[PDB]
Amino acid sequence: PSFIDYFNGIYGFATGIKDIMNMIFKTDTGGDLTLDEILKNQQLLNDISGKLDGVNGSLNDLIAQGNLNTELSKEILKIANEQNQVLNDVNNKLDAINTMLRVYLPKLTSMLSDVMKQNYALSLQIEYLSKQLQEISDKLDIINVNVLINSTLTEITPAYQRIKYVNEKFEELTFATEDILDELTELTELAKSVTKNDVDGFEFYLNTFHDVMVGNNLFGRSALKTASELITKENVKTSGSEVGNVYNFLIVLTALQAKAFLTLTTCRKLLGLADIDYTSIMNEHLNKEKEEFRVNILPTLSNTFSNPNYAKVKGSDEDAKMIVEAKPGHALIGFEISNDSITVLKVYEAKLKQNYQVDKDSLSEVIYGDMDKLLCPDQSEQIYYTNNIVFPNEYVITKIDFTKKMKTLRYEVTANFYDSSTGEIDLNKKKVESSEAEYRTLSANDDGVYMPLGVISETFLTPINGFGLQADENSRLITLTCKSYLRELLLATDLSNKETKLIVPPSGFISNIVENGSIEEDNLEPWKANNKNAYVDHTGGVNGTKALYVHKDGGISQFIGDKLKPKTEYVIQYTVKGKPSIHLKDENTGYIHYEDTNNNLEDYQTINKRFTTGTDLKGVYLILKSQNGDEAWGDNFIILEISPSEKLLSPELINTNNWTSTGSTNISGNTLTLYQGGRGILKQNLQLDSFSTYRVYFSVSGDANVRIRNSREVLFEKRYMSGAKDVSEMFTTKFEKDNFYIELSQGNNLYGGPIVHFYDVSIK
Amino acid sequence: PSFIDYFNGIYGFATGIKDIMNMIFKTDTGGDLTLDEILKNQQLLNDISGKLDGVNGSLNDLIAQGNLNTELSKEILKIANEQNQVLNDVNNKLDAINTMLRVYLPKLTSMLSDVMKQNYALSLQIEYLSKQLQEISDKLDIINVNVLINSTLTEITPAYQRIKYVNEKFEELTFATPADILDELTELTELAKSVTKNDVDGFEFYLNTFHDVMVGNNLFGRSALKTASELITKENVKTSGSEVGNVYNFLIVLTALQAKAFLTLTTCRKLLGLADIDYTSIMNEHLNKEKEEFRVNILPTLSNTFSNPNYAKVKGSDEDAKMIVEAKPGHALIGFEISNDSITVLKVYEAKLKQNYQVDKDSLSEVIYGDMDKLLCPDQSEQIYYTNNIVFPNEYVITKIDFTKKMKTLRYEVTANFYDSSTGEIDLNKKKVESSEAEYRTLSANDDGVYMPLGVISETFLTPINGFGLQADENSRLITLTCKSYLRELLLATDLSNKETKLIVPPSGFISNIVENGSIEEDNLEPWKANNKNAYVDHTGGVNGTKALYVHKDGGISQFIGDKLKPKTEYVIQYTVKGKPSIHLKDENTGYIHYEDTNNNLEDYQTINKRFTTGTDLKGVYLILKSQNGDEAWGDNFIILEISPSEKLLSPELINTNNWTSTGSTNISGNTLTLYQGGRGILKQNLQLDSFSTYRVYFSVSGDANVRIRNSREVLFEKRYMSGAKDVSEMFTTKFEKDNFYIELSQGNNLYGGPIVHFYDVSIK
């Protein structure tokens, strides 16, 4: 589960905790004593009143039982009235204490609830970031332990254990809370053990945690440094960059510390103790850790991130192409390639606001499906022009083309100028391509090639500065490495202690049209059941969800006709169990776009297909029934709009009307003829792109020589000599694109009479 | 944050804390055994007692004066007895509370006020030294180390953390010191109960283990001092001091930790009214054992030389200049500092000595020099650094260091005056050493500037300088100034012998500046002043945590500094400012404008530093900070330094036409020399050259010639230019000679008759 709200940085929740601490302090419960002192005085007055009241009762009873004289009874009544006045004063004080305690208890419960509210509001972010931390930690099963790591762990685990224990137990008890003192026994014990001055108390371990993190030890290193060196390992394959991962680590550390200080203040207030204002110390710790990370950690980190995983794939080698394009004001900020059933690529766009921030409102998601065929070949070889583009700062990638001509993979990137101060991207473009001199070829192999997979995006969505593809032929690996502006955004917003705003890449598809596809909201306001059957089976679904179910003949339907397009391709996906039947059906007209029937899926199976739409569209809706009369239940309904893929157009270039001939040579329609004995040649000027590839076709008879070259560089040249029946040849252009020409020639002396012929000479 | 005050060494704060502990012992609390007596119930218990005593007295009078004698009277006796029990409990509680409030509270509040007042200065000193030691430790590497270093760290980290935290917490809770006073006393008593509780892992246990690790009584006989010295002595560690000073600073920090820990322990045991133990004996034993360990097993194996900590790329014109870093009569050089914030500047500290090389705080003059980058660095034409480490004997203190950059070479001459160890007077008995000739090193011409030294060149505490050396690395193009100190002797004589120690610390601030309150830290601008009701002290502004001067409309903040100046002497101005300021050093009389800085759209704080000269009446000059036109701007860190004048190089001509001892057929016509072919004649001229100096000989020769500048037994230069000798300038040195040097212009041939050879403009410069 991911959160769509901003993250606000460490400064964000630091200021939040400061506000909560101010809220705790401003409250004036009693302002006279503490809880323990209140209860001690309560017991004191209880015992005093009990003894005095027993005495007075005994006196009154034994004097009323037998009255003897006038003066004796008079003085007895006088002293009894005086003692009763004293008892009334004692009882007044005791009732004042009782009222103080009765206004104390509920006030403290309300304060703890108000605390826990914002504490839980914050805890979700650190929960997701700690989940990512655990994901990166699982990869540490192959990194052997070093003396540095051993020492840092043995030094930090006690303080960390104690701080985590205190925080989690305080949260647990404050949640369990929602006389009362008998119920607050555990909370009071915790507050008394946490606010206790001791040689090895809680504040001691907090301070030593900070000192071992920032590195204020006499002869100790900063634990942030060792943690970054551990995270920044080559064997560890994570989704984001190194800046992002060490930033997540710093986030979890500062969150632990801030929650600890908050629990400390809340416990002090619960016990009625004085207010110490730990805001200053918390800010000192957090800011010192931030400055450590900024000065001695961040500069030596990489801001480039690649794909974490690969997948064996086979892609048709038939001239593929795609164009990951952003809108005029939008930019590219992240990718994700999924290869469960279909090889889909989601791309995130967004408007920028300032200091490379990402506008959450404008966050859009585009889909592509040509990655399989593009990146990986099926049977016959492949070529990739490996070159990591690196645009300068202030430029953000907006368009990334992939043009697979014959068997090459060439890509061109463009970066628009982004003003850092403002959030606008002007139409000042810098175009780079994959240089020629450095290409790498994957040989034809029966098994599939390893295509990138997973999330290619910074831990927090940010603009992309550079793009590159790499290929390894020894292992047939492919990697897509991008470059982000996270260092700049951090140094500008969070490491300068200013307002931060960040977005985390979500796990699901934002663009999917089917609302409540996962069916997590128990109320099916989007969906609906026609007949009194087919309901929400909570036990079913993708483990912890609420699946849609069908029994007899009543199918659950959802209207999604409007949010579609005509003839545009779409991708359907859904997990189901039993014998289901899914149909994307239109009420008007009997057109059936997607239909899935007859699937004895005893266990949950994930079906993913592609289709097209062609109808009125406005009257279309999704339907889930049961095959014939059986029962079945599904979940995770997804319908994605994949962007149309453009077909690579190939101009003929060569035309019979552009054959500059010299000497005895004749061009008849579509045939060329060079006569032996003459010094003639057929030169033709061409217009070739910069770093493109081209394919020349010839059908030649006789001895011939052909050279496609420039004045100072030659792309292709060959004398086929006797045999030249038919030949197709690939040739590249490199950084040239100027004054290129083809020469059909044959230089000999006393060869007269015979001739050489060319047919179907073409550049495609 | 330095402090200009005699840092009395371990002996100092040791005896101070011993006195404080004895005073704490002398404090009398009495019967303060009722700690679990809430003092905030005095009024309640007093009211209850005052209201119950009346009833008790009424019952007593009834049973006494009353004539009733019956079991009724017996029951009345029982009732009175129960009321008396209640009253007696209330009165016992009230009496305990009153005693604790009128005997136990005033004594302790006074005692703790005194404890804190005395700990103030010790805390200041030890906090500065702790900052320095933490910088050093940051400059350390502990990744790849032995088993002994690892064991010492394992053994010393927990106790160190515990003791440091406990000291800081006790200091905070004491400074904390009505319901607030009693709550703070409750916090102090909780901390005291935790510190003094009977467990094997108590504060005392950690103190004793800290001592055992400092002395070497651990598993491996490895004292923490030995690992500290081994880690600080490595080549990678570059600090502003020697190994002696750095390990002594380590010892100071840790012994101060221990002493303050013993003080907190005594204060806690007294606050809880516990049996006294007299930790003064244990404190003295620990500190003396650790000082003895340092003196015996650590100090002898340390080097008392300190070099430059940092380097900076810098260039310098090939123009020749002479500099004389000297100390006034009776003074001595005790430290330097090369700062290149904006321009290269050299602070030099001079002070009179008192005894055992102790520096006098009162006499701590500071001089400034500005021609260090133009002297230590070349611009575009190579450089020759003469490198030799001088080492004077004991009782001799450096007073003058003279750099003479005659040509493209660098060489220095040091002078050391005799110093009496017993008294504090430095006689005028001088020993002069120079940079030996045979060992010079050349930096080739390179477009990129050379790495000039930078940082504080001085022991951790200002001490006299014994020897000086310049070293140069050609491959790395580095330059280092390695000086030698007397800290070992000053310590063996004062501190490690348990005697009154007096140590000063490099102030880390241009004391020489004439702008009072330049940093503007004192909120009350008694020196400065505002003409109009505007331009005030912006506390939020300034170098992070300071109080900057501000200007808005047309009222500029001014400070009078006309007197403390000189006419035509060069000065350096420096100041940080934000906004659009306008700084002017203006004289009320005459419209002369010495320094003027206007039009600087410094949106962020920028540090402007410039040089200038003064020429006016001077007595009516003052500094002014206004805003350009009408904008606003605020600055801070105002500094005006008087740089010592630099002397220009005077190079004797030496060669005069009136001293040409000619032999054979040779003729000298005015400024031309002519040797006739066919004759056995030669032109010999005697010269007077200095010991370790360089000279440049210029010739314009026509014909075949040979020239040799040599002595009777050594030759400085010799060359036969043969056919072509149109013009030639040659550098030559003298080495350890300076006696009977002569130039010979000669050409030896047989049957060559008729032609001649001519020399012109032959000069030695």
Automatic annotation (TrEMBL), chain A:
Keywords from UniProt, A to Z, are: Hydrolase
Q: Which InterPro entries match?
A: CenC_carb-bd, Galactose-bd-like_sf, Vip3
Cite a single Pfam family from the UniProt record. Vip3A_N
> From which domain of life does this come?
Bacteria
Keyword Hydrolase attributed? yes
SUPFAM superfamilies recorded for this chain?
Galactose-binding domain-like (SSF49785)
Sequence ranges assigned to domain CBM-cenC in this UniProt record: 511-627
A Gene Ontology MF term for this entry? hydrolase activity, acting on glycosyl bonds
What name goes with this protein? Vegetative insecticidal protein
Q: Which organism is it from?
A: Bacillus thuringiensis
Which gene underlies this protein?
vip3LB
